[PDB]
Symmetry: D2
Subunit: 119 residues, 4 copies
């Protein structure tokens, strides 16, 4: 299932719960251990996916502010959960920083990340 602890290619970890209603709620930790690198995450998923072998669509956001740090930026991940033995969540993400109007053209990075339940 989606609920659990997930690991990114380069060590990021996130813990999420998938609610009956389609909610995602949890915490995203940018660096292994370390209280100062944990951030709130919230999102949504398709709680009644197709039964044709497709994945389950989802997305979530982290604003990079906690009680210790603020990067004045937020990342959204959009993707799907693929169940099985080696369950995976495959994503593409957008990272937007607060900018002046003149710098808005360079406000947003794009990338991709794959998460697995194994370290």
């Amino acid at each position: 299932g989606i609920t659990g602890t997930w690991y990114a290619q380069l060590g990021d970890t996130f813990i999420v719960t998938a609610g009956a209603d389609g909610a995602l709620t949890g915490t995203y930790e940018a660096a292994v251990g370390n209280a100062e690198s944990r951030y709130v995450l919230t999102g949504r998923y398709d709680s009644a996916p197709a039964t044709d072998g497709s994945g389950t669509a989802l997305g979530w956001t982290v604003a990079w502010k906690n009680n210790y740090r603020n990067a004045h930026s937020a990342t959204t991940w959009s993707g799907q959960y693929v169940g099985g033995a080696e369950a995976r969540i495959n994503t593409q993400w957008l990272l937007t920083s607060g900018t002046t109007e003149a710098n808005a053209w360079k406000s947003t990075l794009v990338g991709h990340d794959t998460f697995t339940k194994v370290k």
Copy 2:
């Protein structure tokens, strides 16, 4: 407060209502252009609740999964962008829309676009 809480309209007529929490939470309801109650979906997200005061915008993002009690598109959109407050407040976003696919078909799983929202229409 920050001026995010309220009702916002995009260039295509979609509208959303949002409440910005003092802690960084975004909650609300997104209504696609066509349909009324059949077209309302849950939205949830996060924003920078302590933004810079140097002329920069306020970073945010939110997600809508396209399932409600009427319809299910087996898809979800995430919007990433910044809020520009004041007299002519706007939220400028780029978005990704992922539909559930097999891995073989994942190359056609994700659309990209951009939406600008105003508190006016």
Copy 3:
């Protein structure tokens, strides 16, 4: 309809020829005036588009190196030409910088631009 001079909302301009064979060839000026700000553009377009009112798919690339400057970057624009009283090319773009593998996660910006045809 594509052949000609085009300008975007932020002031950049380009001049392009759409060849009978599908080629796009031209010059991109990142800043109106200023002859040290011209770069080679090349790309491709659909030379036999649908006749149902749909736009014409196209794309092009500029590497940001010329005789005077080198940003070690390249932008690609993907979009469609929409004919009209005021013709437009509506695009989304990706700007990738050369990075170390460690910084590859922040190698690529994403944005959008609309160009309007001069005269």
Copy 4:
């Protein structure tokens, strides 16, 4: 070097020549089929990259029209070449289809692909 034959995860292949002047030219072949599935590619690359362990920025376009078929669409790939033992080209891409105005919101797919010179 960039010049050579490259392979994608799910069977696409392309052949490219990198000119001394920053030009990319070649042919892209979709996974299934052959000449029916071969298309012209053109692009640009940084012909003098940084000497600091950074990759080499590049981009190219394919319009999905050849003598046999026409999908009324085009893909642009933006990325970088990373040299050495296992040389790779890492990209993100945008695929735009010609659409009516009402369908323009869903004109553009986004993805990512890595290419290698090995099988």
